[PDB]
Ligand binder design. Sequence first.
Ligand SMILES: COc1ccc(-n2cnc3ccc(-c4n[nH]c(=S)o4)cc32)cc1
Ligand SMILES: Cc1cccc(C#N)c1
Length: 341
Amino acid sequence: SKVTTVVATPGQGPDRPQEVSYTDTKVIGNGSFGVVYQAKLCDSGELVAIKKVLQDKRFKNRELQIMRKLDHCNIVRLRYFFYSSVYLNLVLDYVPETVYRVARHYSRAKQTLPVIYVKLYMYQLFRSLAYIHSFGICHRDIKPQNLLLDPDTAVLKLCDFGSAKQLVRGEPNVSYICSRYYRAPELIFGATDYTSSIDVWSAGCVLAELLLGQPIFPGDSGVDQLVEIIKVLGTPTREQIREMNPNEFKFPQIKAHPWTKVFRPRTPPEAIALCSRLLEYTPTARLTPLEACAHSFFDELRDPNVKLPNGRDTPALFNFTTQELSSNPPLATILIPPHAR
Ligand SMILES: COc1ccc(-n2cnc3ccc(-c4n[nH]c(=S)o4)cc32)cc1
Ligand SMILES: Cc1cccc(C#N)c1
């Protein structure tokens, strides 16, 4: 197998290029995100992923800019970046599995993903959002394919930052963004000036999907997506519109569908309770990521005796930086339990 030696800049150092040799290069994804490869680093033995994303020659990549600004255990780490045939190559932590494949295995086996795995996976998604959100970075593509899992350690790493943007207060962004099923209604309603909270809607969609075993708003066109969200939440008050986008569309007033009525009869109430505080027609209603962590739902994860279904200890959950504890710093007592402090 070809040993490839590139010249690569570290992610977190100064711009200080190294010869980096990798091998066992296979391609494991190839799509709208470009090409993702698997590789083994020759000297460490460590597995890595390598996203090869299109670059002009003199057009400034935003993903890379953002990529080096981040160091969170629930975000996939940019180990190196380098160039080839011009293409930007991002050498990443390898993470074997995605929530999308996991969710589907269950779905296909007419089985629901154990609520505890929903607790962990959501928790780490919500921490990672509380992370990138403190920097005002909206991921803008939160969907099951974009949360990577290690199934053995239960670690979730949020990935693919190819749509993330440093959201500027008072500035216009595209409204046709995110994957249809996960796209907030403001986005649907052509809003060009949206908060980072669209992520948190997207996340609520992931959570509800994990509980329902199917997407919750599976529309079969951009327009139809509204029809799916109404089926559940109801017609948004014209007020609720004002609070989504000021300005379109034409709709009659369909009734809301109660929250307990949406989820299969045995779902924990703290789970349903949460969605209601995520899937809000109102962005300013959607809980901040950091608030979402403090939620009753993730209290089993605040148990000192908590274990994985394979006997093991949970991954890092309480290593909050003060950078992270900045949306609402008075949340440590009900975020950091009395054992990791
Ligand atoms: C076919 O299923 C899989 C394909 C690839 C991966 N994969 C493994 N380690 C990874 C690290 C980073 C990324 C990634 N970040 N942004 C984009 S786009 O891809 C993907 C990774 C997992 C499962
Ligand atoms: C966007 C995305 C997520 C997860 C895996 C891949 C690949 N290959 C791409």
